[PDB]
Amino acid sequence: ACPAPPPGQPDIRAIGYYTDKAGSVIDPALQQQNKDATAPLDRYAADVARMSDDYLRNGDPAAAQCTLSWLGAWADDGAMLGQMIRVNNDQSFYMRQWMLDAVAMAYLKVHDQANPQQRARIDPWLQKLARANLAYWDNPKRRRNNHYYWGGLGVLATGLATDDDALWQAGHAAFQKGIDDIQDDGSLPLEMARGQRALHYHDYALAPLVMMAELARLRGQDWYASRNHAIDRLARRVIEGSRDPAWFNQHTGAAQLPLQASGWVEFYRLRSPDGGVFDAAHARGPFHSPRLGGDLTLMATHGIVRTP
Numbered sequence: 001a002c003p004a005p006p007p008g009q010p011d012i013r014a015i016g017y018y019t020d021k022a023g024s025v026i027d028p029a030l031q032q033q034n035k036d037a038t039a040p041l042d043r044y045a046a047d048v049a050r051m052s053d054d055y056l057r058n059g060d061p062a063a064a065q066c067t068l069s070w071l072g073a074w075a076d077d078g079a080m081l082g083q084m085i086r087v088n089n090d091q092s093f094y095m096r097q098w099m100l101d102a103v104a105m106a107y108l109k110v111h112d113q114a115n116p117q118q119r120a121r122i123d124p125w126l127q128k129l130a131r132a133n134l135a136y137w138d139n140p141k142r143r144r145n146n147h148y149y150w151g152g153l154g155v156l157a158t159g160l161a162t163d164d165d166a167l168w169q170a171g172h173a174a175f176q177k178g179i180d181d182i183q184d185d186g187s188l189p190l191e192m193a194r195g196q197r198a199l200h201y202h203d204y205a206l207a208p209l210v211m212m213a214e215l216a217r218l219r220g221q222d223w224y225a226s227r228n229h230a231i232d233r234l235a236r237r238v239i240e241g242s243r244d245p246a247w248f249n250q251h252t253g254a255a256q257l258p259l260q261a262s263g264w265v266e267f268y269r270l271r272s273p274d275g276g277v278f279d280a281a282h283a284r285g286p287f288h289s290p291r292l293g294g295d296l297t298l299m300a301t302h303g304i305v306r307t308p
């Protein structure tokens with residue numbers, strides 16, 4: 001009934017594909033190279049997202065058991081615990097953050113179906129990945145942009161799922177720095193340097209901050225207020241921006257590519273409706289993002305976990 005997972009590959013060889021300082025102009029060949037190189041890794045994320053999605057949607061323990069089986073198999077095969085091969089950037093390192101986000105959110109969603117044996121295999125694997133990811137951001141030489149907020153999510157979810165309180169404080173630190181990076185105009189200095197993709201990267205930075213906030217809401221915290229409701233400013237700046245890019249066009253000097261707000265809106269519309277600014281974007285749903293935890297619509301309506 002539970003199909004065979006792919007072999008957990010120890011090595012990642014992804015490929016950065018922007019050709020300009022702003023990281024805004026794509027080389028299509030390079031975009032294709034990286035896509036084919038990562039396509040197996042992305043198939044796995046989507047599968048555990050969907051199977052964990054199937055469990056949250058209809059309560060079937062087989063969907064949760066098949067998810068635990070697949071995560072069980074990847075831990076055992078030491079998946080992505082090897083070399084992050086550098087082709088032309090740290091693209092392989094980023095994938096290990098994104099994959100951790102996908103595999104740890106999937107685990108959290110089915111964790112109440114887990115028995116001690118499956119816990120024994122998965123936790124040390126997630127924790128190895130989560131500590132490996134944190135240890136990249138120990139170097140001060142590396143700009144803590146949206147990549148740091150995306151790393152933060154997996155580390156936080158691994159902290160919550162494995163109940164590793166060091167990892168949770170690390171995750172929270174990532175979320176703190178994101179909120180702290182929000183200027184009074186709702187903008188992020190590091191994301192403002194992405195020319196025509198500036199608005200995309202604002203939406204892209206915000207989504208993992210919103211997911212971390214929603215993870216804190218599972219532990220009975222409320223991070224949303226931090227720094228005098230700073231997240232609402234960035235939220236406003238992105239949702240106003242998907243409607244009207246004039247501010248981003250003026251502030252960066254680049255004509256923005258059109259953006260449709262990502263699945264962070266499914267939760268955020270419930271936390272602070274702001275008149276209902278997210279209603280058009282919500283109507284574009286459901287939102288599927290394995291890197292953010294899968295079906296954001298289902299999780300916003302019915303919760304990330306079926307029981308605390």
Ligand SMILES: O=C(O)[C@H]1O[C@@H](O[C@H]2[C@H](O)[C@H](O)[C@H](O[C@H]3[C@H](O)[C@H](O)[C@H](O)O[C@@H]3C(=O)O)O[C@@H]2C(=O)O)[C@@H](O)[C@@H](O)[C@@H]1O
Nearest residue numbers: 016017018023034042089090091094145146147201204291
């Ligand atoms: O075709 C898609 O839309 C593709 O998007 C994928 O996620 C992107 C993500 O949107 C984001 O742009 C990210 O950007 C990185 C970039 O890869 C590079 O490393 C740069 O130096 O840093 C950027 C950054 O985050 O600051 O790249 C993601 C990626 O995988 O390249 C996926 O959502 C994919 O499933 C989708 O089809």
